[PDB]
Amino acid sequence: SLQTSFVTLDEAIKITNRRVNAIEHVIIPRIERTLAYIITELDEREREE
Amino acid sequence: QVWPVRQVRPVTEKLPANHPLLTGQRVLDALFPCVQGGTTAIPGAFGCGKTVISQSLSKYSNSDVIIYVGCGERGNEMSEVLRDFPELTMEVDGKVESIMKRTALVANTSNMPVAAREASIYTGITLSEYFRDMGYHVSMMADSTSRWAEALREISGRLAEMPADSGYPAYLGARLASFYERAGRVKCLGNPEREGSVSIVGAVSP
Amino acid sequence: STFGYVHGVSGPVVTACDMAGAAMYELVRVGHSELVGEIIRLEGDMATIQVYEETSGVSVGDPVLRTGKPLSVELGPGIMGAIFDGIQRPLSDISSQTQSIYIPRGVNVSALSRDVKWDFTPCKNLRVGSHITGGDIYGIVNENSLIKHKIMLPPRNRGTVTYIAPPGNYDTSDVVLELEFEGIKEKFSMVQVWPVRQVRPVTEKLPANHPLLTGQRVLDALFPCVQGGTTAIPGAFGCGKTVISQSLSKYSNSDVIIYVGCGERGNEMSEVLRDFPELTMEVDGKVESIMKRTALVANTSNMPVAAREASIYTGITLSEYFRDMGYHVSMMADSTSRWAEALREISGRLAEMPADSGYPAYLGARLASFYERAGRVKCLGNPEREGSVSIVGAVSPPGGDFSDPVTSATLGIVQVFWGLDKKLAQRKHFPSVNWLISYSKYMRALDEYYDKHFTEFVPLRTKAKEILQEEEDLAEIVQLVGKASLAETDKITLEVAKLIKDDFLQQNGYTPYDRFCPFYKTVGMLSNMIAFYDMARRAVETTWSIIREHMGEILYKLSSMKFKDPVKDGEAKIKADYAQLLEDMQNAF
Amino acid sequence: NYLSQPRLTYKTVSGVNGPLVILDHVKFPRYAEIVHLTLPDGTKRSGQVLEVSGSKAVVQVFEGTSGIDAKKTSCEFTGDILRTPVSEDMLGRVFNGSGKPIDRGPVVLAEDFLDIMGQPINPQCRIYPEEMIQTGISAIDGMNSIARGQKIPIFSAAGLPHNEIAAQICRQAGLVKENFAIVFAAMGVNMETARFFKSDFEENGSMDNVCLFLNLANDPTIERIITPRLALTTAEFLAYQCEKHVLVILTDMSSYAEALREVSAAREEVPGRRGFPGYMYTDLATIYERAGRVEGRNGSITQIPILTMPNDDITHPIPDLTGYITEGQIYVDRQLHNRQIYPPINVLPSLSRLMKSAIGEGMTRKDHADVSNQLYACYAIGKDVQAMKAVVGEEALTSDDLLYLEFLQKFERNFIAQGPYENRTVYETLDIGWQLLRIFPKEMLKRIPQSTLSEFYPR
Ligand SMILES: Nc1ncnc2c1ncn2[C@@H]1O[C@H](COP(=O)(O)OP(=O)(O)O)[C@@H](O)[C@H]1O
Numbered sequence A: 001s002l003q004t005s006f007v008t009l010d011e012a013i014k015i016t017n018r019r020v021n022a023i024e025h026v027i028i029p030r031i032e033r034t035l036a037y038i039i040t041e042l043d044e045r046e047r048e049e
Numbered sequence B: 001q002v003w004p005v006r007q008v009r010p011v012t013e014k015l016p017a018n019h020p021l022l023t024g025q026r027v028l029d030a031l032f033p034c035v036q037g038g039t040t041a042i043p044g045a046f047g048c049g050k051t052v053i054s055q056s057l058s059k060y061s062n063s064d065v066i067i068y069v070g071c072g073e074r075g076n077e078m079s080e081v082l083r084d085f086p087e088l089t090m091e092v093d094g095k096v097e098s099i100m101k102r103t104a105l106v107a108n109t110s111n112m113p114v115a116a117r118e119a120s121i122y123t124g125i126t127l128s129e130y131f132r133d134m135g136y137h138v139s140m141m142a143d144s145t146s147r148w149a150e151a152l153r154e155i156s157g158r159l160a161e162m163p164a165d166s167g168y169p170a171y172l173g174a175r176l177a178s179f180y181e182r183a184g185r186v187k188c189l190g191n192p193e194r195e196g197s198v199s200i201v202g203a204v205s206p
Numbered sequence C: 001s002t003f004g005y006v007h008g009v010s011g012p013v014v015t016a017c018d019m020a021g022a023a024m025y026e027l028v029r030v031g032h033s034e035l036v037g038e039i040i041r042l043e044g045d046m047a048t049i050q051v052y053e054e055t056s057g058v059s060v061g062d063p064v065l066r067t068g069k070p071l072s073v074e075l076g077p078g079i080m081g082a083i084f085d086g087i088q089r090p091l092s093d094i095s096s097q098t099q100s101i102y103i104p105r106g107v108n109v110s111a112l113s114r115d116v117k118w119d120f121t122p123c124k125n126l127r128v129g130s131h132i133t134g135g136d137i138y139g140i141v142n143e144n145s146l147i148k149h150k151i152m153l154p155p156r157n158r159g160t161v162t163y164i165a166p167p168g169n170y171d172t173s174d175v176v177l178e179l180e181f182e183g184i185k186e187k188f189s190m191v192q193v194w195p196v197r198q199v200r201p202v203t204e205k206l207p208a209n210h211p212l213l214t215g216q217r218v219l220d221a222l223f224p225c226v227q228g229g230t231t232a233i234p235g236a237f238g239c240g241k242t243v244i245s246q247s248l249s250k251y252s253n254s255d256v257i258i259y260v261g262c263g264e265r266g267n268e269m270s271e272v273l274r275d276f277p278e279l280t281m282e283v284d285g286k287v288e289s290i291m292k293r294t295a296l297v298a299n300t301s302n303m304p305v306a307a308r309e310a311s312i313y314t315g316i317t318l319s320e321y322f323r324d325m326g327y328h329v330s331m332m333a334d335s336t337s338r339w340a341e342a343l344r345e346i347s348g349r350l351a352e353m354p355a356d357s358g359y360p361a362y363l364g365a366r367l368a369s370f371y372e373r374a375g376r377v378k379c380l381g382n383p384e385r386e387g388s389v390s391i392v393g394a395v396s397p398p399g400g401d402f403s404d405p406v407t408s409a410t411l412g413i414v415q416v417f418w419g420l421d422k423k424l425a426q427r428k429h430f431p432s433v434n435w436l437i438s439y440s441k442y443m444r445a446l447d448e449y450y451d452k453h454f455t456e457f458v459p460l461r462t463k464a465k466e467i468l469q470e471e472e473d474l475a476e477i478v479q480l481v482g483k484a485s486l487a488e489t490d491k492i493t494l495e496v497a498k499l500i501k502d503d504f505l506q507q508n509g510y511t512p513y514d515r516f517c518p519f520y521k522t523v524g525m526l527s528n529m530i531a532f533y534d535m536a537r538r539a540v541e542t543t544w545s546i547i548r549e550h551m552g553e554i555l556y557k558l559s560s561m562k563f564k565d566p567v568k569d570g571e572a573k574i575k576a577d578y579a580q581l582l583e584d585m586q587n588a589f
Numbered sequence D: 001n002y003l004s005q006p007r008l009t010y011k012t013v014s015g016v017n018g019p020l021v022i023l024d025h026v027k028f029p030r031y032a033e034i035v036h037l038t039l040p041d042g043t044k045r046s047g048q049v050l051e052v053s054g055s056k057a058v059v060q061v062f063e064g065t066s067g068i069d070a071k072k073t074s075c076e077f078t079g080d081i082l083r084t085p086v087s088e089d090m091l092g093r094v095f096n097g098s099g100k101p102i103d104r105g106p107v108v109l110a111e112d113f114l115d116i117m118g119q120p121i122n123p124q125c126r127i128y129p130e131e132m133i134q135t136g137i138s139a140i141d142g143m144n145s146i147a148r149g150q151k152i153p154i155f156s157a158a159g160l161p162h163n164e165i166a167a168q169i170c171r172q173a174g175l176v177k178e179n180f181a182i183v184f185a186a187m188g189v190n191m192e193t194a195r196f197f198k199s200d201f202e203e204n205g206s207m208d209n210v211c212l213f214l215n216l217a218n219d220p221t222i223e224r225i226i227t228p229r230l231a232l233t234t235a236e237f238l239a240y241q242c243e244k245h246v247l248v249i250l251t252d253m254s255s256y257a258e259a260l261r262e263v264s265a266a267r268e269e270v271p272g273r274r275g276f277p278g279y280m281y282t283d284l285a286t287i288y289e290r291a292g293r294v295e296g297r298n299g300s301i302t303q304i305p306i307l308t309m310p311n312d313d314i315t316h317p318i319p320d321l322t323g324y325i326t327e328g329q330i331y332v333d334r335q336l337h338n339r340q341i342y343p344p345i346n347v348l349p350s351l352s353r354l355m356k357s358a359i360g361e362g363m364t365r366k367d368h369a370d371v372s373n374q375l376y377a378c379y380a381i382g383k384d385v386q387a388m389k390a391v392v393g394e395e396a397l398t399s400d401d402l403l404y405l406e407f408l409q410k411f412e413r414n415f416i417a418q419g420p421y422e423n424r425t426v427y428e429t430l431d432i433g434w435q436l437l438r439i440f441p442k443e444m445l446k447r448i449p450q451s452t453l454s455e456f457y458p459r
């Protein structure tokens, strides 16, 4: 009963550890360098005005 | 004959384009094909290969005559052209002749003055439309059309004109439209009833 | 002409007419109340003047009195212990003259009072008829017990002496020197007037070699600064900012300390103005105040914005004036982010084009032209002295991010960056100087002086930094894997790294014996912490468990080396010698 | 031939705002004319005429308008454009940013007076650079090899050792197996930056041919405009008119364009991106395209301009516009500098457009064009694999990609990391490069055909 709980937990804690790191490395830096592009492109409209 | 560069050459009637332009590249000929008499734009940052598409088209296309307009280009890139062109021969009638005999260059490098970038574009497309009327299939490579746009910005800044988006004048899109619309496969004026074409492949530098 | 008329005021700007012989960036006095302005455009006979004060009640026809000078400072005795604002109005003298709690905005009170008498002495072989050039030490005024205010010649003029003053007491208005030149003999008093935007001339620049002994252990060992160098620190709300500023004034090797509070706050400025006159200095004799060698530029946000722009240039000119006497000046500018907001206001006033995030095109040029005024440099003159100017400029970026048009322009110019951290102040890790992001470009210069004076030090720093970087890399895997799977050579690095972070890096500023540790103690505690680390390498590669339980008294000797009181100076080196050999005994066991 | 009429002196200023002085009642003013301002206290300031309209002439003084009077200042109109005194003895000395000697020296004796704006080279008589310069650095000589007559910048940032690799390629510049006259423009530099370059050129004994032009940060910003102009018209003199191979080092080119933005914003000209002027591409190309070699001359000029990109952005207007004019760049990175690699050169955004004609059988040897493309491809895949083991795990990758991990730790530590004074030859670089390709199998090297794999991969 502890054997079959142990073997299905780490194969379900690997898929959670990937979903955290896919947020931390692929999704969060992509939004943050998008948000940096919004700021400098809006500053470039203010100099044109 | 003396023809003004800002005036479109008269011609009998425009024709739809049917024969493709064979650039020699596989991704260019298969997925995104170009015709002779069509308009093409190559944007891209530095180091992407906007001149390797331009040099492989001026060496290996199906076009009768080739012109190459260096508009704000590098000085070494026009000296690169006139070295390997007199040694690259091609075969038309079983005879071998270099591709410099069908090539004509309009060189206005970035060191040269900025208002000549406007004049070098209109000079080329007049030479492109001149060999169109003989019945040849002309292909024109403008490199770069973004330097022509930077020339119009710097001239209109001196006249205190009011700017459109990002500095450029409000008549920027009318200058580009009046230059790409001089291309096309089209039946020429005259009695022997020949047909020519002008292809424009213009590099953009965003 | 001598006066101009107003001919129209449209805000801060006054377009004054009848101004034909006026120069650019010249200061005037507008109106009956004599509001100080600055000539900024000059259209023929008319000049437009931006006025530093509130133009309110200014008529069309009011006299614009031109001064013929640009924004300049008065340099002379009466400047130590004084408190000015950015355009150098004495705030301590202006409250006694008017007996009010405000600044009356029409007050042309002189920066150095002409009523106090100072004991002047000549240069003693500066005879009458002697040729003298600019920068020569002309006399000496005993301003305090500490500061000998050496009267000098201005670097503009030159001549031969015709009259010198006899040694006695004189004002700042008395004529002390007459010099004959080709046309006309010029006379002048002990005070010289020098513009703030113009760098003081000097004989030749020198590379900086002598380090600044700040007193803190993380600052003096890992990330050292030199006198004549440029330093930057983060200026956040509370990490260690007032602690590092007051330790630099109290326990440094520097002769005078100037502090430029530049557009700071309402109540953060009053914290400085009440705490600095009640600090204490440890001279060879009896304890004196820190205000005998201190001059403050106090400038709040309520004050004129063209005084907050000039507060940086006022301070560095006072820094260069006491540099020319031969002293070692250290300047603390707090902060340079509030100064850059004053540039954005002046450029936004004149409708200048915004270059980078609002800030004008010349933001990186004004910052370059300020940090380059600091340096160890041989002064002008024949007595051949040497001086220096150090600059510690605080940076207050938004949100603690180090990507900013002011921050990135600062870190590309400064060489030392003591990275003070907010989270290290949350754990009461004092001082809060982070060691991952901090750096110092002043190692090679220092490397010369440390082989003439300390010798066995450099390699000590290199391996101590190698421990702290390998500790952070190891600490990531402690939560992922565990300490039971870690190798034997690695786990001895972790305990001595914790030993460094508590004994070396942590330093309590209220525990008397730690207020100003001098140098050998700093080479002392690190020579025993890494020799213990080096001896543990071969002792492991010869069990980590048996050494950790049996060295608990020997580790207690290392963890108590910071309590060597200042009644133990030579004895502390003997205890440093004997505590090392107790480690040498237990290596074989 | 010679201007012999006496120059006029005007006390007729009518407006001064910012750096611009407006002179009235000038009789036939001239564009780009140089003038001399005499202040009411006696200090002399120079200035260029940037606009003339009828009788008015708008000049800009180089040292700023601080103190310029309206009634008492006197401007004297030198009847010609700004020409510098250039000579052969203009070599071996250190000068300031404007024109003047620094090391207690005389003014130059002026073999001729050359216009500092120059004039562009005819592209018909400009020969293409072919011979390769061996710089002794494997990241330069191996993967992004420069030619003699090539313009190629060093793309750097603040704090990175770009000055240290600038002095390294000056000591070790030689032909692939009669010295290079180095002209050095120091622009907006620190004092410790100028002392580093002075004490390096005075150390290797090359200071008999160094033309160092230094312009510190305390010096005015309008003099930074004419600083590469004077540093390139002496290099034009030494190479096209004195028959000598010249290496020009421009630093900092970011300090040039930030000084160029200040003058443009003061003239109220039209801005481009981030406040920089619209003619910034032209002004950068009038100092970049003055390089290369011509047909009738045996001398040449190569340019290595150092620029620091703001906030590590390669899409900033400084490295983008210099990337469109020059012939490939060198990218010294920051993430490789933290790992204590002395040239922290990320080779992926590095390029050399003239490297193809400079490699081959006659130039170095047969395998140079092929091992450089394979070292590029294995570094490109292994770095994308490096972004996969940081997000998934160090163990669950493809078995081929563990060799890509073993390649990258051997690439960044053995191939590019060489030390401040080690000067490898080009044959040493390809021999080290084949050692790193040895850890890959023969059939995974896709960019190399099977012919030259037989001669080099079994070893
Ligand atoms: N077909 C190709 N084969 C090999 N290398 C290429 C090819 N196309 C481009 N390159 C490389 O790309 C580099 C940049 O080419 P380039 O035309 O100058 O880009 P751009 O003009 O946009 O700056 C060239 O120097 C060359 O090394």
Ligand SMILES: [Mg+2]
Residues within 6 Å of the ligand: B050, B051
């Ligand atoms: Mg190109």
